[PDB]
Amino acid sequence: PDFYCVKWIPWKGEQTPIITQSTNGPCALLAIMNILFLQWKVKLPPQKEVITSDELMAHLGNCLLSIKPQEGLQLNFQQNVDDAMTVLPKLATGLDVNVRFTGVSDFEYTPECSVFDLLGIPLYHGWLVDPQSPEAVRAVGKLSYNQLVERIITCKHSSDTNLVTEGLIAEQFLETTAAQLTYHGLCELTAAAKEGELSVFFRNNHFSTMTKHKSHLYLLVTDQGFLQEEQVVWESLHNVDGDSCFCDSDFHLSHS
């Protein structure tokens, strides 16, 4: 959990490095930092076999601090920086996000949110309510999965089944849509999702590098296991659940 292993993969023309989580924690630095290496925003000596939470960290800070501003955020930006810079070292350990269920770019604002909101990197999650189920739209509203828990516990105690009825039928929406994704979220995600531009995906307090390529949603292979395999580069999110096909950089299929 201290060091990290480099996959070294031919991508977009040249030999490009990438990082592999084996521990598989609430680990979002590997997920962001990855993006930067692809974007070639951070170059690594061709040599490098390994890298530390230390290396990765300081690499990101020089990368954030090298953002000159774009006129939304004006001197609002100047605090967006301070916010992020300060909760930067947080990313090393891990970071909960309060996911909203309204939309796939909808969260309660952590100040760790500010790192993405500054690196022009989108964050998305799959855990959306289904307007193809009316009770949720009403019985969940704009509440978040840290604010819905607080609320379900309030309803379990209200002597008024008018608002226990909700408190039951929220308990449904979790003790069912456990996998933090719905078919609905998954579809709606591809909707928002710009082709070919890389992003980050939240699920079960766990972070993934993402993209849409030929209008399907393919993630990266942050798994250390498939490691000598340069051609094994993207897994699919073609499906609500099941199995996924693997690819080389150019999104051609590959086999062990």
Residue numbers in the entry: 111 to 181, 185 to 369
What does the paper say about this structure?
MINDY1 and MINDY2 are members of the MINDY family of deubiquitinases (DUBs) that have exquisite specificity for cleaving K48-polyUb, yet we have a poor understanding of their catalytic mechanism. Here, we analyze the crystal structures of MINDY1 and MINDY2 alone and in complex with monoUb, di-, and penta-K48-polyUb, identifying 5 distinct Ub binding sites in the catalytic domain that explain how these DUBs sense both Ub chain length and linkage type to cleave K48-polyUb chains. The activity of MINDY1/2 is inhibited by the Cys-loop, and we find that substrate interaction relieves autoinhibition to activate these DUBs. We also find that MINDY1/2 use a non-canonical catalytic triad composed of Cys-His-Thr.
P138 sits in a hydrophobic pocket formed by A141, I142, L204, L208, F229, and F320 to function as an anchor point for the Cys loop. Based on these observations, we predict that P138 modulates the dynamics of the Cys loop, as it provides rigidity to the loop by anchoring itself into the hydrophobic pocket. Hence, the mutation of P138 to alanine should dislodge the hydrophobic pocket interactions and result in a more dynamic, flexible loop. To test this possibility, we determined the crystal structures of the MINDY1 P138A mutant on its own and in complex with K48-Ub2. As hypothesized, the absence of P138 results in a less-extensive engagement with the hydrophobic pocket, resulting in a more mobile Cys loop, as suggested by higher b-factors of its residues. In contrast to the WT enzyme, the P138A mutant was readily modified by UbPrg, thereby supporting our notion that the P138A mutation makes the Cys loop more flexible to reduce the steric hinderance to Ub binding. Next, we determined enzyme kinetics using fluorescently labeled K48-linked pentaUb, which revealed that MINDY1 P138A mutant is a much more active enzyme with >10-fold higher kcat and ∼3-fold lower Km compared to MINDY1 WT. A chain cleavage assay with these mutants shows that disrupted anchoring (P138A or P138G) increases chain cleavage, whereas increased hydrophobicity of the side chain impairs DUB activity.
